[PDB]
Amino acid sequence: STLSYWLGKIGDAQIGPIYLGATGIASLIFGFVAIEIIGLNMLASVDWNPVEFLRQFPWLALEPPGPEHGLRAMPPLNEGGWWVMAGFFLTASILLWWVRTWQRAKDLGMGTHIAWAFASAIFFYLVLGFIRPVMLGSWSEAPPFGIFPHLDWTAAFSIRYGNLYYNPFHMLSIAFLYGSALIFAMHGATILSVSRLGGDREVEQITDRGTAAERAALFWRWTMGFNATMESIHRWGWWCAVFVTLTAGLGILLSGTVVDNWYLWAVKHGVAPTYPDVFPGVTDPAA
Amino acid sequence: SPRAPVWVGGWFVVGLITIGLLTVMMGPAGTYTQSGYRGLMMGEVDMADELADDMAAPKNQVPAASERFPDEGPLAGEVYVNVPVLAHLSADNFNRLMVAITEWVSPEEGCNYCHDPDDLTAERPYTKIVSRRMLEMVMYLNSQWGDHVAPSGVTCWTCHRGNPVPENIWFKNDDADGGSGALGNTFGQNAASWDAGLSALPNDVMEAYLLDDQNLRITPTNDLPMNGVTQIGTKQAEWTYGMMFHISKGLGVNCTYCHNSQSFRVWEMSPPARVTAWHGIQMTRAINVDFLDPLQPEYPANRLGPEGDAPKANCATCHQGAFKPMYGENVIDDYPSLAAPG
Amino acid sequence: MTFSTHKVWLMFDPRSTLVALAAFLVVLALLIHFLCLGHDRFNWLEGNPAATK
Amino acid sequence: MTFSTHKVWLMFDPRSTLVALAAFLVVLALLIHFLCLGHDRFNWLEGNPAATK
Amino acid sequence: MTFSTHKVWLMFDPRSTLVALAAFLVVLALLIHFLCLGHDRFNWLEGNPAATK
Amino acid sequence: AMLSFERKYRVRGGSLIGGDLFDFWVGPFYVGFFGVTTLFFTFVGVALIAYGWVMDPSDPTVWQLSIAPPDLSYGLGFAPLMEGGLWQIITICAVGAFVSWALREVEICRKLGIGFHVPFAFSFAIAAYVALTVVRPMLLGAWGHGFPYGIMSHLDWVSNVGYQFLHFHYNPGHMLGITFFFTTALALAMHGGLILSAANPGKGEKVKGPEHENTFFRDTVGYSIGTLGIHRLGLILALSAVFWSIVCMLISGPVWTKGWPEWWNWWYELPIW
Amino acid sequence: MIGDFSSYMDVAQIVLYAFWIFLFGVIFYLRREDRREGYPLERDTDGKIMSIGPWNLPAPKIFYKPQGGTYSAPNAARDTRAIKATRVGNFPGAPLDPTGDPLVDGVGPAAYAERADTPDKTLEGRTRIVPLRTDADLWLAPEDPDPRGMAVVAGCRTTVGAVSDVWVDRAENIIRYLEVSLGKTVLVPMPMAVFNDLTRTVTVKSMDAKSFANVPTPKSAEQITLREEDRIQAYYAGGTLYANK
Amino acid sequence: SSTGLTEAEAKEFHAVYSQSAAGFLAVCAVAHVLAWMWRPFWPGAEGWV
Amino acid sequence: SSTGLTEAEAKEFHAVYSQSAAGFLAVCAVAHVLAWMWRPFWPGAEGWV
Ligand code: BCL
Ligand code: BCL
Ligand code: BCL
Ligand SMILES: CC[C@H]1c2cc3[nH]c4c(c3C)C(=O)[C@H](C(=O)OC)c4c3nc(cc4[nH]c(cc(n2)[C@@H]1C)c(C(C)=O)c4C)[C@@H](C)[C@@H]3CCC(=O)OC/C=C(/C)CCC[C@H](C)CCC[C@H](C)CCCC(C)C
Ligand SMILES: CC[C@H]1c2cc3[nH]c4c(c3C)C(=O)[C@H](C(=O)OC)c4c3nc(cc4[nH]c(cc(n2)[C@@H]1C)c(C(C)=O)c4C)[C@@H](C)[C@@H]3CCC(=O)OC/C=C(\C)CCC[C@H](C)CCC[C@H](C)CCCC(C)C
Ligand SMILES: CC(C)=CCC/C(C)=C\CC/C(C)=C/CC/C(C)=C/CC/C(C)=C/CC/C(C)=C/CC/C(C)=C\CC/C(C)=C/CC1=C(C)C(=O)c2ccccc2C1=O
Ligand SMILES: COC(C)(C)C/C=C/C(C)=C/C=C/C(C)=C/C=C/C(C)=C/C=C\C=C(C)\C=C\C=C(C)\C=C\C=C(C)\C=C\CC(C)(C)OC
Ligand code: HEC
Ligand code: HEC
Ligand code: HEC
Ligand SMILES: CCCCCCCCCCCCCCCCCC
Ligand SMILES: CCCCCCCCCCCCCCCCCC
Ligand SMILES: CCCCCCCCCCCCCCCCCC
Ligand SMILES: [Fe+3]
Ligand SMILES: [Mg+2]
Ligand SMILES: [Mg+2]
Ligand SMILES: [Mg+2]
Ligand SMILES: [Mg+2]
């Protein structure tokens, strides 16, 4: 239980102690196995040279099986089996960590809201790595374990399914991420503005409304015509954050399974803008 | 020691001078050209000084050509002995072509690079045998691939640019594979490779498209999946993307030069340059399949690749970083002999 | 730890030690089984010929 | 501000002012050095010919 | 202001006014030097001929 | 005096122009001078968007509506009203309306006696919009660099501007902004869940206080940010996300004119190796 | 085809509309939770309670407070304290004018809520905000300046007194108020105070010398209730509008 | 008054401020004369020819 | 005054700061003379020709 002056300026200064418990130890074991697999595959990909590892770490990854393997339960190791093992161990560690958060909420007498907000992110992660590859029958549709590689996977996923900008659930997830940033800036600024009135002590304001909660409500009522309460704004933020990953999982489930081209889907439904033909005589040379 | 309150205004002035530092440090701003419709932002982003420097580069200056002799005289096939591909040229034009070729391929090494120093008739060096197939390839490109290289045409300068080895050539496993034993498979990607624009994209795509006829068309032509049409291809999309990095770097252009990002698939929304690029892909594949690869037995081990394969050409071999080779300078009008086989 | 070092449980809590050991053993067993499945000669469900070369 | 304006420090506290002034001077020096480096005639490291047209 | 109007500092803070004036002067000087650097004739570091058409 | 506790707070004061003429409410909304200007600019802009919608020859839907900026050939000049001038006027009205909204929030804060953290944070979104439609276009010398005012066409603008650098994911400022946006959602989920768990402990449990709130995070991650530190952290995260978005867009075109992946050659070929 | 119901409809469109229904239900639920304080509404002209449907006002939820008691929301309690402010004509939206001293009366930015008349407690049941002179387990970090002994300057550039003690939150280890002995003792909320460690001064620009002499004081000199806290904080917040002007 | 000075501190500050501003303006004028002798500022009818 | 520094300590500080600034400006003038002797930085009418 050490102290931290620099962290004590933005917030509290105490770091620890941390309670791991049984599920915490299990999650750490699973996750360390996953991290060891990923990192050792990265280090072997530069022929064990740590100079080249330092040079190329953003470009390095553990790569999923190729499409030639399909949904083979355990492909050959150096052909995606390492990726499948790392994904299994990471998923087990993440699920055990979710159970750990649920249990920590229960043992403190607190509600399990953080656990069910983590469940949305776990749902998105599972759709990204396991659930969608199972339905499409190919491990190759899953992100690599790498810094620049999962950005490449992101771009190539958008390109493969025709401009994921035209995925309505991608639009909704972007709206919810922008709204998460919007709502959290709103709430941070509002609570900081009424911090002179005791507004940072929100739970005390929930069971006993003070002038801080009243003025925080009235600022937004006079600004945009409606407001929340000291507790309801946290439900607003919680739901906005949950919807990000919920719509993300929903829009990734629908890509390739029910919709294969999103721009053409928007064209069918009157969503894609039509632009004046600046290039009048361009056709497909292979037609 | 007492804590000094932060001078907000002084640090604001320091912030302004740091903004000035950033402006002098990182740009006179790039120059834009608009190719498509307003609000789309389809066009080229170029630094004016760098674009001017690349146009004023020595490789982009086509050497001056001497006045062409009238094609009415003794042919080269009767004056000379071993001239199977240039037996229809007048001997004066044959000598002019030899001088031009020396200026284009081996100006430093001179006439002796491709010829025996004491016998011009002897086909001793491998360079003469390679140069004969070079001549045949240039004639084939000019006569048969006008859909791409016309009206500028191609000569020995288009690829070689004054040195015997063209600047942008490639081999099969041009990027060394990573991984020791059962660990570290890079899958032909996940490296800081300049073939993929220094991205972690597939850096060995030229073999699938400029030597093989693999499909670059990943985007479906229907909004909904079909029963027999594949529903996957994200990793296959990375191969197309890496190939498009190669294409963009070889021409010094961005994706919007040939595509509307709204849909990379729709040709009706694409600039007419995408049609020329399609013919360029077909022509590069034809070059590699027909001329450059069957030359592997004629090369020494010093010229081959890590896989023992012949050197091959790509988009960047001719263009050398410009939308057109030498930015559009005509090179075939001065040499009608290189425009068609005899 | 030996058959006669029964005083270890005065220093290590039996409950947490057993749970951590169970977690470690399950992870090790899964890792080894997956490593066997990840090789041609030892994937018993893929059933490649034993002579793998 | 001259040699005789010694009471400027009764308005601007030196401890909260000299650090900002030093930062400003360092940034100005970097700005001018990079401005000289950004031109062909004054980039002393590249060593281009003095006569640049 | 004028050489005689000394009572302006009973209305304008002598220190915040100096800080704001220094910021304005630095920004104006940077803007005008950049405007001179962005034109062929008055870019003294590029050294184009004065007669620039 | 609409809420059950609002009557005692509805007093005179807070005006930034020094006058009682506009000091009044219409329904729940407070009207100021800047409220009037906000409505002026807003109705002008909305009516011009409707005009551009009904004058579109392709009969677009609400999604396909697009008021595009002028051509890049018009430079920083003035375009015909049907050739980019409408976009220019809507941009001016939008900037005016957003600044007026921020100033009206300043007025409301002054009336309520609270800090100006909210107008200051909204100024970051206003700065992002300005850097996208005014500053970056002037840095590039043409208003045609701004995004079209359409629900779906501004997505196409974003896509094509990103593919002008062949891989926008490799922009370092883009990476920082995405990291901060995802961290903002993570922190908002954690904070909302913690406050909801403290306020709704369940059946048979009392409402938990600051000790339980700090204990939950010290027991989970190993550090507790506090109840005042979490809101500062959230405001800082959102503002950093928007600031790094502004940086990444101001270095794309004005600074970087080539592919974004090759910018990392500074690290791949750092003088060390 | 795979994901189609017709030549126009398809699975993604239906999933999108299902999410639209779910999102609109969630927004409705959230707006119901927004109405747990301040509703039902009242008119700006006579204070008549406006009728809100039972589908917009949720049923009261009970909060079991940590130190005992049950708070319900909504609670049918309405703030009906007499506001010492007037307006000419009961026009909807017309702002009010304080009759006397708005800071002492609590009008506008000086208005405060009738919170609990008991001090805030901790988990173990001991007073949360206490002066540092009473607790020996709490000290001030040596890396930060000590506010005690610093001169206190109001918004009129007048030294109104000196800091005698600091009141610390025992649940968060943070200084909540500054006990200032006026040159007779007042509590200054820390967010309303700016510290200068070089000149050893604390500036409270929201107060004048006249306003400091009327700051509400706690009944106890080592104990402050939530209502006293709320009143003092509201006084200093209303000073931003009513003091230097 | 409004700033806290007493018309004597203000007079001294205005004295030093007037000298500093006059010196800065004189240096600016000298610099402008020098920059005009370098390259004249205002074009003729035919431009920079 | 508003700083709390004594009018004599401020005088000493200004003396030392004045010497430091004068030395800095002398070094800058020498550096500018050396840089002009290396490559003059005010072009003539012909430019850098
Ligand atoms: C299995 C029945 C007994 C037991 C019976 C014995 C006997 C007998 C001996 C040991 C010995 C050892 N035991 Mg023991 N040991 C037990 C449980 C454990 C546990 C545990 C937390 O469960 C651990 C970590 C160990 C670890 C160890 C090693 C530190 C030590 C020799 C290392 C070794 O052989 O390399 C390999 C070690 C590992 C790969 C990790 C340990 C895993 C297993 C459990 C180790 C058992 C090895 C032992 C030789 C097997 C004998 C069991 C037969 C039924 C006799 N024992 C249980 C309680 N153990 C030897 C010793 O200390 O002599 C100097 C020895 O002679
Ligand atoms: C420079 C020394 C003195 C000073 C000496 C004088 C004298 C003498 C005169 C003025 C006059 C004026 N001064 Mg004065 N003035 C000072 C500093 C200022 C500052 C400032 C914040 O520093 C400002 C905004 C001004 C503003 C002004 C103008 C309102 C007015 C004439 C406007 C003008 O000529 O437009 C051009 C200028 C601008 C658009 C920007 C203003 C910036 C500079 C500082 C203006 C001063 C120009 C002045 C003619 C210089 C003469 C001083 C010589 C060095 C002796 N002064 C200092 C204190 N000033 C004139 C006046 O009042 O007319 C009846 C006048 O005769
Ligand atoms: C360097 C030694 C002294 C000093 C000695 C003098 C003397 C002597 C004079 C000034 C004058 C001025 N000083 Mg002084 N000055 C000092 C430090 C400063 C600092 C600072 C924060 O460091 C600033 C902003 C200034 C600013 C100024 C100007 C406002 C004013 C006239 C403008 C000018 O000449 O050029 C425009 C301003 C700039 C380009 C930026 C200012 C930076 C430098 C330091 C300006 C000083 C130049 C000075 C003339 C050179 C003499 C130094 C010799 C080597 C000894 N001084 C130090 C304390 N200063 C003159 C004046 O008041 O006119 C009547 C004048 O005669
Ligand atoms: C609402 C949706 C958002 C969200 C939600 C969310 N995520 C969450 C939570 C919530 C509400 C949690 O409660 C949980 C959490 O604890 O957060 C702090 C979690 C979480 N969000 C995470 C990350 C994360 N969230 C992301 C995103 C988001 N999460 C969404 C935007 C992303 C992105 C942008 O991709 C990431 C990367 C984790 C920090 C955490 C879950 C941690 C976890 O699963 O841990 C188990 C996995 C492991 C690999 C274990 C660690 C293995 C190491 C080897 C440990 C070291 C062991 C060693 C022995 C220690 C000692 C060493 C000695 C030398 C000292
Ligand atoms: C800086 C951190 C985040 C932030 C902060 C923030 N935004 C804020 C606030 C804060 C703190 C407010 O106080 C304020 C508010 O009141 O919120 C309810 C606001 C606000 N954030 C808003 C939205 C918003 N914030 C966004 C983002 C963010 N806001 C950041 C992520 C986005 C994004 C990413 O897209 C949007 C859409 C509004 C709800 C509100 C400001 C309302 C406002 O300005 O009202 C006055 C203007 C009008 C009523 C309409 C004017 C219309 C124009 C005249 C014509 C239309 C022009 C427009 C460009 C057309 C666009 C077409 C297509 C591009 C769609
Ligand atoms: C002269 C003349 C013409 C007169 C007429 C005058 C008229 C007609 C009106 C008045 C003047 C004006 C300018 C009126 C404005 C008109 C308009 C356009 C109004 C709407 C503007 C607007 C921005 C509306 C909202 C838009 C949206 C969708 C915003 C996003 C909000 C969101 C995602 C979630 C809502 C969550 C809420 C309610 C947050 C607020 C909130 C926050 C952030 C807390 O932290 C907090 C803390 C403690 C207690 C309460 C709160 C609280 O309520
Ligand atoms: C040498 O290294 C040392 C030892 C120093 C350790 C260091 C390690 C380092 C440096 C590691 C670095 C790792 C990095 C940078 C990783 C980055 C990863 C990123 C960015 C990933 C992004 C996305 C990945 C996703 C979404 C993956 C999802 C995968 C899933 C969900 C897979 C699930 C698989 C399952 C459930 C498999 C089950 C087993 C079955 C059932 C198939 O068995 C039959
Ligand atoms: C490699 C790039 C060459 C350079 C350098 C030079 N020449 Fe060439 N030469 C080359 C080829 C491929 C051929 C065969 C022509 C054909 O139709 O296949 C030739 C041939 C000649 C000959 C004919 C000799 C004979 O057949 O007996 C002559 C006389 C000749 N070349 C002259 C010549 C001169 C003068 C050169 C320097 C300017 C020169 N060659 C360089 C390829 C190459
Ligand atoms: C002209 C030199 C081009 C540049 C610049 C870019 N692309 Fe390319 N693209 C070009 C052609 C000739 C083709 C057709 C190839 C074929 O075999 O038909 C394409 C096609 C694509 C595709 C696939 C289209 C499909 O039907 O699925 C993609 C995904 C694509 N192009 C992407 C892309 C990117 C990302 C670019 C910037 C790096 C880019 N293209 C530039 C020609 C040209
Ligand atoms: C040498 C044989 C070349 C190879 C290999 C490639 N290109 Fe090329 N290209 C070549 C020439 C001589 C010209 C000039 C055409 C003209 O009209 O003068 C071109 C031109 C193009 C263009 C047109 C650019 C424009 O602005 O219109 C494109 C789009 C193009 N080439 C694409 C392209 C690609 C993608 C290639 C690799 C597959 C490629 N070219 C190879 C000569 C040669
Ligand atoms: C564009 C998405 C939807 C945004 C809707 C925001 C609406 C905010 C304004 C609400 C105004 C309510 C006015 C009536 C309040 C009660 C008066 C008795
Ligand atoms: C309107 C006549 C036809 C078009 C002539 C050219 C118009 C564009 C060039 C002049 C205007 C551009 C510069 C505007 C600068 C504004 C700075 C605020
Ligand atoms: C037709 C769709 C309707 C969707 C309604 C969604 C309602 C969501 C409610 C979430 C919160 C429930 C209450 C949780 C209180 C705390 C429990 C510990
Ligand atoms: Fe909060
Ligand atoms: Mg390879
Ligand atoms: Mg390669
Ligand atoms: Mg280019
Ligand atoms: Mg079907």
CA of F87 to the centre of ligand 9 (A): 31
Quick check: A26 and C23 in contact, CB under 8 A?
yes
Contacts of H19 in chain D (CB under 8 A): 2
Quick check: A111 and F216 in contact, CB under 8 A?
no
Residues in chain A: 287
Helix residue ranges per DSSP H, F113-166: 117-130, 136-140, 153-163
Quick check: B90 and B69 in contact, CB under 8 A?
yes
Q: How far apart are CA F22 and CA A7, in angstroms?
A: 45
State which ligand 6 atom lies nearest to the alpha carbon of A182: 33
- Structural Rg of chain D based on CA atoms: 18
A21 by DSSP, 3-state: which? helix
Q: Is A129 in the pocket of ligand 7 (CB under 6 A)?
A: yes
- Ligand 11 probe mutation, A221, A226, A236, most atoms within 8 A of CB: A226
Quick check: F223 and G87 in contact, CB under 8 A?
no
Nearest C-alpha neighbor of B288 from the set B215, B213, B203: B213
Q: How far apart are CA A256 and CA B225, in angstroms?
A: 7
Q: How far apart are CA G48 and CA A72, in angstroms?
A: 71
CB–CB of H1 and E52 under 8 A? no
Q: How far apart are CA F179 and CA F233, in angstroms?
A: 14
Q: Residue F26 contacts by C-beta under 8 Å, 6 or more apart in sequence?
A: G93
Quick check: B220 and B236 in contact, CB under 8 A?
no
Q: How far apart are CA B83 and CA B97, in angstroms?
A: 13
Which amino acids of A are annotated as binding site, given as ranges?
Answer: 150, 165, 170, 187, 202, 234
Which partners does chain F have (≥3 C-beta pairs < 8 Å)?
A, B, G
Quick check: B331 and B157 in contact, CB under 8 A?
yes
Q: How far apart are CA B218 and CA A139, in angstroms?
A: 18
Q: How far apart are CA I49 and CA I46, in angstroms?
A: 6
What letter would DSSP give residue A129?
I
Quick check: H22 and H14 in contact, CB under 8 A?
no
Q: How far apart are CA B75 and CA B94, in angstroms?
A: 9
Quick check: G113 and F27 in contact, CB under 8 A?
no
Quick check: A204 and A79 in contact, CB under 8 A?
no
- Ligand number with the minimum distance to the CA of A190: 6
Integer angstrom CA distances of residue A85 from A31, A64, B288, G124, G192:
11, 10, 41, 48, 56
Whether E17 has a binding-site annotation, put simply, is: no
Q: Residue B232 contacts by C-beta under 8 Å, 6 or more apart in sequence?
A: A67, A136, A138, A140, A141, A256
Contacts of C30 in chain A (CB under 8 A): 88-89
Which partners does chain H have (≥3 C-beta pairs < 8 Å)?
D, E
Quick check: G85 and G108 in contact, CB under 8 A?
yes
What phi and psi values does residue A84 have, to the nearest 5 degrees? -65, -40
Q: Residue D28 contacts by C-beta under 8 Å, 6 or more apart in sequence?
A: B17
Nearest C-alpha neighbor of A172 from the set G139, F151, B95: F151
Burial class (CB in 10 A: 0-12, 13-18, 19+), C13: exposed
Burial B8-44 (b: 16+ CB within 10 A, else e): eebbbbbebbbebbbbbeebbbbbbebbbbbbbbbbb
G12 by DSSP, 3-state: which? helix
Q: Residue B125 contacts by C-beta under 8 Å, 6 or more apart in sequence?
A: B113, B114, B115, B116
Chains F and H touch (3+ CB pairs under 8 A): no
CA of B169 to the centre of ligand 16 (A): 10
Beta strands (DSSP E) in I1-49 are none
Q: Residue F145 contacts by C-beta under 8 Å, 6 or more apart in sequence?
A: B32, B41, F69, F72, F136, F137, F253
Q: Which two tokens stand for residue C49?
A: 């010929």
CB–CB of A244 and F185 under 8 A? yes
* Half-sphere exposure of residue A65: CA atoms within 13 angstroms, side-chain side: 25
Contact map slice: I 12-41 vs E, CB within 8 A: 41
Q: How far apart are CA A214 and CA I42, in angstroms?
A: 66
Nearest C-alpha neighbor of F163 from the set B254, E1, B167: B254
Q: How far apart are CA G39 and CA G57, in angstroms?
A: 8
Q: How many CB atoms lie within 10 A of CB G238?
A: 29
Quick check: B305 and B311 in contact, CB under 8 A?
yes
**β-pair type (B43-46, B169-170):** unpaired
Nearest C-alpha neighbor of B193 from the set G10, A169, F265, G70: F265
* Half-sphere exposure of residue I17: CA atoms within 13 angstroms, side-chain side: 21
User: Searching chain G, which residue's CA lies closest to the CA of residue A267?
Assistant: G8
Q: How far apart are CA A122 and CA A119, in angstroms?
A: 5
Q: How far apart are CA F208 and CA F200, in angstroms?
A: 8
Residues with CB under 6 A from ligand 10: B 141, 148-149, 151-152, 154, 158, 247, 250-251, 273, 276-277, 280-281, 284, 313-315, 317-319, 323-325, 328
Nearest C-alpha neighbor of E17 from the set H17, A253, A85: H17
Give me the residue label for tokens 């962005």.
Answer: E38
Sign of the four-CA dihedral A267, A268, A270, A274: positive
Q: Residue G151 contacts by C-beta under 8 Å, 6 or more apart in sequence?
A: G159, G161, G162, G163, G200, G201, G202
Give me the residue label for tokens 């500018």.
Answer: I32
CB–CB of E14 and H10 under 8 A? yes
Give me the residue label for tokens 């510290």.
Answer: G195
β-strand partners of G134: none
State which ligand 10 atom lies nearest to the alpha carbon of B323: 24
Integer angstrom CA distances of residue B204 from B146, B211, G243:
28, 12, 74
Cis geometry, peptide bond prior to residue G191 (ω within 30 degrees of 0)? no
Quick check: G61 and A231 in contact, CB under 8 A?
no
β-strand partners of G161: G152, G182
Quick check: G147 and G128 in contact, CB under 8 A?
no
- Ligand 4 probe mutation, A27, A36, A97, most atoms within 8 A of CB: A97
What letter would DSSP give residue I47?
B
Nearest C-alpha neighbor of A271 from the set F152, B54, F191: F152
Q: Which two tokens stand for residue F236?
A: 């800082």
Burial class (CB in 10 A: 0-12, 13-18, 19+), F207: buried
Q: How far apart are CA B37 and CA B18, in angstroms?
A: 37
Task: Identify residue G230 by its one-letter amino acid code.
Answer: D
Work out the angle at residue B234's Cα, subtended by the Cα atoms of residues B231 and B240, and round it to the nearest 5 degrees.
Answer: 115
Q: How far apart are CA F207 and CA F204, in angstroms?
A: 10
CB–CB of F24 and G65 under 8 A? no
Q: How far apart are CA G189 and CA G239, in angstroms?
A: 12
Burial class (CB in 10 A: 0-12, 13-18, 19+), A108: buried
Q: How far apart are CA G128 and CA F132, in angstroms?
A: 48
Q: How far apart are CA G225 and CA G232, in angstroms?
A: 11
CB–CB of F200 and A14 under 8 A? no
Quick check: B286 and B143 in contact, CB under 8 A?
no
Q: How far apart are CA B198 and CA F255, in angstroms?
A: 19
Q: How far apart are CA F188 and CA F180, in angstroms?
A: 12
Q: How far apart are CA C32 and CA A74, in angstroms?
A: 13
Query: For residue E49, what is the enclosing H or E element?
Result: none
Q: Report how far Cα A115 is from the mean position of its chain's Cα atoms.
A: 14
Q: How far apart are CA B109 and CA A99, in angstroms?
A: 75
Q: How far apart are CA F47 and CA A177, in angstroms?
A: 29
> Experimental method used, please?
cryo-EM
Work out the angle at residue G190's Cα, subtended by the Cα atoms of residues G189 and G194, and round it to the nearest 5 degrees.
Answer: 120
Nearest C-alpha neighbor of A63 from the set B191, B273, G228, B16: B191
3-state secondary structure chain B: CCCCCCCHHHHHHHHHHHHHHHHHHCCCCCEEEECCCCCCCCEEEECHHHHHHHHCCHHHCCCCCCCCCCCCCCEHHHHCCCCCCCCCCEHHHHHHHHHHHHHHCCCCCHHHHCCECCECCCCCCHHHHHHHHHHHHHHHHHHHCHHHHCCCCCCHHHHCCCCCCCCCEECCCCCCCCCECCECCCCCCCCCEHHHCCECCCCCCHHHHCCCCCCCCCCCCCCCCCCCCCCCCHHHHHHHHHHHHHHHHHHCCCHHHCCECCECCCCCCCCCHHHHHHHHHHHHHHHHHHHHCCCHHHCCCCCCCCCCCCCEECHHHHHCCCCCHHHHCCCCCCCHHHHCCC
Quick check: G45 and G89 in contact, CB under 8 A?
no
Give me the residue label for tokens 């500053």.
Answer: F135
Quick check: B94 and B78 in contact, CB under 8 A?
no
Q: How far apart are CA B84 and CA B96, in angstroms?
A: 17
CA of B203 to the centre of ligand 16 (A): 4
Q: How far apart are CA B245 and CA B219, in angstroms?
A: 17
Q: Mind telling me how many Å the CA of G34 is from chain A's nearest CA?
A: 4
Q: Residue F192 contacts by C-beta under 8 Å, 6 or more apart in sequence?
A: A113, A117, A234, A235, A236, A237, A238, A241
Q: Report how far Cα B204 is from the mean position of its chain's Cα atoms.
A: 15
Q: How many CB atoms lie within 10 A of CB B59?
A: 17
Give me the residue label for tokens 């007493």.
Answer: H6
What letter would DSSP give residue F134?
I
Q: How far apart are CA F189 and CA A238, in angstroms?
A: 5
Q: How far apart are CA F152 and CA F157, in angstroms?
A: 9
Quick check: E22 and B13 in contact, CB under 8 A?
yes
Sign of the four-CA dihedral C4, C9, C12, C13: positive
Integer angstrom CA distances of residue A256 from A70, A259, B214:
15, 5, 21
Q: Is C2 in the pocket of ligand 1 (CB under 6 A)?
A: yes
CB–CB of A81 and C23 under 8 A? no
CA of B264 to the centre of ligand 18 (A): 26
Q: Report how far Cα B212 is from the mean position of its chain's Cα atoms.
A: 17
Resolution to 1 decimal, in Å? 2.7
Contacts of F52 in chain B (CB under 8 A): none
Listing DSSP states for H1-49 in one string gives --SS--SSHHHHHHHHHHHHHHHHHHHHHHHHHHHHHHS-SS-BTTB--
Contacts of H17 in chain D (CB under 8 A): none
Q: Mind telling me how many Å the CA of F68 is from chain B's nearest CA?
A: 5
Contact map slice: E 12-41 vs D, CB within 8 A: 14-15
Q: How many CB atoms lie within 10 A of CB B143?
A: 12
What phi and psi values does residue F194 have, to the nearest 5 degrees? -65, -45
State which ligand 6 atom lies nearest to the alpha carbon of G34: 38
Contacts of B226 in chain G (CB under 8 A): 1-2
Task: Identify residue A145 by its one-letter amino acid code.
Answer: F
Quick check: F214 and A12 in contact, CB under 8 A?
yes
Give me the residue label for tokens 């590249």.
Answer: D46
- Determine the straight-line distance between the first and last CA of chain F, rounded to whole angstroms: 70
